[PDB]
Amino acid sequence: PVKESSFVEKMKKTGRNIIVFYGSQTGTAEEFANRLSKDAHRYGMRGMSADPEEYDLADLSSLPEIDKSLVVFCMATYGEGDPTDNAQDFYDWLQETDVDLTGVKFAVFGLGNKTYEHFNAMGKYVDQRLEQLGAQRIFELGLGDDDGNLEEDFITWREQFWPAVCEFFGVEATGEESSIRQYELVVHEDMDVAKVYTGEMGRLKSYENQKPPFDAKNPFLAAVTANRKLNQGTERHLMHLELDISDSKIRYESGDHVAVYPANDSALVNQIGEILGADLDVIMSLNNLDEESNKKHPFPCPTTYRTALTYYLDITNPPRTNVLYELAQYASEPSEQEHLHKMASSSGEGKELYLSWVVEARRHILAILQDYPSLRPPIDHLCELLPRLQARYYSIASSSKVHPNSVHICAVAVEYEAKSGRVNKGVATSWLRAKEPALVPMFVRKSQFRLPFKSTTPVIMVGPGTGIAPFMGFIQERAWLREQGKEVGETLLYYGCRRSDEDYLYREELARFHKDGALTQLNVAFSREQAHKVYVQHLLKRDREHLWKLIHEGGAHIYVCGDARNMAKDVQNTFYDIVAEFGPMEHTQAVDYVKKLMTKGRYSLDV
Ligand SMILES: Cc1cc2nc3c(=O)[nH]c(=O)nc-3n(C[C@H](O)[C@H](O)[C@H](O)COP(=O)(O)OP(=O)(O)OC[C@H]3O[C@@H](n4cnc5c(N)ncnc54)[C@H](O)[C@@H]3O)c2cc1C
Ligand SMILES: NC(=O)c1ccc[n+]([C@@H]2O[C@H](COP(=O)([O-])OP(=O)(O)OC[C@H]3O[C@@H](n4cnc5c(N)ncnc54)[C@H](OP(=O)(O)O)[C@@H]3O)[C@@H](O)[C@H]2O)c1
Ligand SMILES: Cc1cc2nc3c(=O)[nH]c(=O)nc-3n(C[C@H](O)[C@H](O)[C@H](O)COP(=O)(O)O)c2cc1C
Numbered sequence: 039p040v041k042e043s044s045f046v047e048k049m050k051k052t053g054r055n056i057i058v059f060y061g062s063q064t065g066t067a068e069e070f071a072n073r074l075s076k077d078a079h080r081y082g083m084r085g086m087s088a089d090p091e092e093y094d095l096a097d098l099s100s101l102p103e104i105d106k107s108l109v110v111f112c113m114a115t116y117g118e119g120d121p122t123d124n125a126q127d128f129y130d131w132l133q134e135t136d137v138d139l140t141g142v143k144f145a146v147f148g149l150g151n152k153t154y155e156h157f158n159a160m161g162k163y164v165d166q167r168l169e170q171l172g173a174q175r176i177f178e179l180g181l182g183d184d185d186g187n188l189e190e191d192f193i194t195w196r197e198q199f200w201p202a203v204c205e206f207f208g209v210e211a212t213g214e215e216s217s218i219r220q221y222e223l224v225v226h227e228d229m230d231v232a233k234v235y236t237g238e239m240g241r242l243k244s245y246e247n248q249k250p251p252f253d254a255k256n257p258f259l260a261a262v263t264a265n266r267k268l269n270q271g272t273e274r275h276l277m278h279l280e281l282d283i284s285d286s287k288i289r290y291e292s293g294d295h296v297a298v299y300p301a302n303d304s305a306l307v308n309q310i311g312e313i314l315g316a317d318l319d320v321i322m323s324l325n326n327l328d329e330e331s332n333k334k335h336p337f338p339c340p341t342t343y344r345t346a347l348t349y350y351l352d353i354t355n356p357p358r359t360n361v362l363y364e365l366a367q368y369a370s371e372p373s374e375q376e377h378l379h380k381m382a383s384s385s386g387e388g389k390e391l392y393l394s395w396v397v398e399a400r401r402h403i404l405a406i407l408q409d410y411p412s413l414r415p416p417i418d419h420l421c422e423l424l425p426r427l428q429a430r431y432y433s434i435a436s437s438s439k440v441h442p443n444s445v446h447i448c449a450v451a452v453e454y455e456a457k458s459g460r461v462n463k464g465v466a467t468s469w470l471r472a473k474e475p476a477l478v479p480m481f482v483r484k485s486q487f488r489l490p491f492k493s494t495t496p497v498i499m500v501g502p503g504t505g506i507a508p509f510m511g512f513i514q515e516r517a518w519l520r521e522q523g524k525e526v527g528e529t530l531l532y533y534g535c536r537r538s539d540e541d542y543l544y545r546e547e548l549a550r551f552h553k554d555g556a557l558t559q560l561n562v563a564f565s566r567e568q569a570h571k572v573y574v575q576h577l578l579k580r581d582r583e584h585l586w587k588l589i590h591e592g593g594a595h596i597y598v599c600g601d602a603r604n605m606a607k608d609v610q611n612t613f614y615d616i617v618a619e620f621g622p623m624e625h626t627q628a629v630d631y632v633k634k635l636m637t638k639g640r641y642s643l644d645v
Pocket of ligand 1: 295354400430431432433434448449450451452453454455456463464465466467468504505507508
């Protein structure tokens with residue numbers, strides 16, 4: 039592991055009074071942290087972002103040694119209300135700890151989604167725990183909602199945050215504005231092709247000469263063994279991929295996740311270089327104008343613009359308000375420069391404009407640059423404002439017991455008409471779809487979704503659509519525990535699709551698993567073969583009687599995977615309704631009964 043030296047001392051030697059910590063998994067908490075950090079400057083202060091995993095939060099008790107010190111926590115909730123992987127140490131510390139944080143000023147902005155069981159469990163916990171330890175709070179806990187518009191929640195929070203900080207402290211709004219760069223463009227008018235980054239994530243040339251172990255910092259270029267179309271119809275594109283993980287010493291069980299690092303669309307990369315009048319084949323690097331940080335570049339350098347745009351940056355998701363504000367200065371046409379600046383707006387017509395014209399219309403960077411022709415920003419700066427391309431996760435669709443050498447992926451390619459007028463393409467899926475048996479930089483993330491330990495326990499699997507991914511592994515494995523002489527309890531699947539002749543995923547394989555008894559019951563819900571919708575819940579409601587026999591008397595485990603928005607919630611109320619009917623109890627006590635099955639490892643979600 040190896041922690042970094044005391045962050046308070048580091049702040050002392052750099053004149054920083056505020057540190058902002060990020061509990062990120064996909065770069066959102068990290069992004070917010072960075073914005074708040076650089077914000078401090080225009081308020082008579084100097085901030086600093088930081089990954090908790092790299093430090094000993096115990097040093098928190100030292101922040102008081104710095105004048106007008108402040109710690110902010112931008113945390114995201116994940117798993118069953120669990121903290122993000124980098125926040126684990128911290129979360130764990132917060133508990134065992136006895137430390138006295140007297141004199142510590144803090145504030146917490148949490149990132150969650152009401153769509154889940156444990157809304158901002160992590161954020162709410164950090165804010166609550168630090169106060170117990172003795173630290174004082176200088177601002178109300180923030181509850182951003184990804185389900186609605188997380189970006190806006192953060193803005194209204196940030197808008198109220200700083201003034202309170204300013205008030206509590208002597209500081210105040212200093213000067214007009216800023217427009218300060220984090221990096222310096224050092225053009226390498228000529229450099230050694232062997233010292234140039236071509237798209238690897240960690241060590242230089244790590245993609246070329248592979249060498250275990252492999253992880254998020256060191257992905258394993260797995261070869262694409264197969265890429266099969268699963269959908270019968272033409273409405274959408276659902277595909278099956280098999281990645282060759284031989285000689286990678288990678289370990290995985292059914293239920294785990296596989297992460298992939300994709301490549302943006304080149305037409306979209308080139309057009310950005312083209313409208314910007316820039317040459318993407320310029321070799322360069324952007325070194326931190328702060329020679330005191332670890333983050334020397336905002337991505338592997340030296341590299342070419344083309345490379346950063348292709349493998350290191352996000353050019354398809356809607357630009358955040360701060361990025362747009364920073365760009366406004368490049369709009370020659372004043373009316374256009376207005377719209378841009380006014381989208382960072384505190385609220386009002388501007389907050390209406392950004393939400394509909396950019397987010398709803400789902401305008402990526404290039405689209406903006408096209409609708410505001412007077413906006414031509416220098417390319418080296420745009421690269422500094424663009425967020426990093428994140429790896430995409432997929433629920434490994436195979437069993438290690440059976441395919442220890444391969445990691446399968448069941449996915450639906452994203453492609454749609456945006457409202458922006460253009461057709462959007464899903465980064466990872468469009469990329470995977472183009473792979474023809476072909477390497478995919480990947481890596482596995484251990485999950486909590488797991489078959490039960492004793493092969494005899496009954497399992498109920500509810501996975502509509504692609505939510506069947508992990509279950510293909512589960513079944514593959516149980517089919518194994520039977521072919522292997524072991525005794526297996528009932529294995530039930532509640533799958534759903536549109537029509538059996540359109541997107542019945544794994545129709546054939548699933549039939550074999552039924553004609554062999556690996557699948558006790560194969561209960562499929564064809565949502566569009568009749569005027570009314572027939573969903574999994576309905577099948578569940580139908581078998582209410584038997585399901586209570588496996589749940590209440592059989593000690594069966596419940597697994598739900600798929601859509602979190604509705605399916606998960608719907609499928610849940612049904613289980614409440616079931617329990618509330620059999621071995622009768624009030625509603626309220628049926629929900630507590632159910633919520634108590636998820637606690638005891640018998641009701642697992644993965645949405
Ligand atoms: C733990 C985990 C497991 C997953 N398992 C699977 C799996 O087994 N199978 C599978 O197919 N996917 C799975 N996903 C989804 C997967 O990670 C990708 O999101 C999906 O493949 C698309 O990625 P993309 O990069 O191609 O799309 P992106 O370019 O990243 O775009 C996706 C975003 O576009 C937006 N969007 C999508 N459609 C529309 C529309 N019509 N209108 C407006 N906005 C839209 C949404 O904000 C969405 O978040 C999983 C995700 C997680 C976190
Ligand atoms: N977190 C994870 O581990 C994980 C794993 C796999 C997938 N996912 C996610 O789940 C989503 C699945 O997309 P998909 O295209 O593959 O599924 P889908 O095709 O959109 O839907 C699958 C089936 O479910 C039905 N359905 C729709 N609303 C429902 C509800 N409220 N209750 C019960 N059934 C409902 C559909 O019927 P109708 O279309 O007719 O309405 C259809 O028959 C993706 O956004 C993906 O990100 C997450
Ligand atoms: C698999 C998954 C699980 C999630 N679990 C939770 C959760 O338990 N609670 C919550 O409030 N939000 C949950 N969210 C919402 C995210 O925490 C929200 O999108 C957050 O902004 C992501 O932050 P990051 O980019 O910093 O990792 C989940 C999102 C995903 C994709």
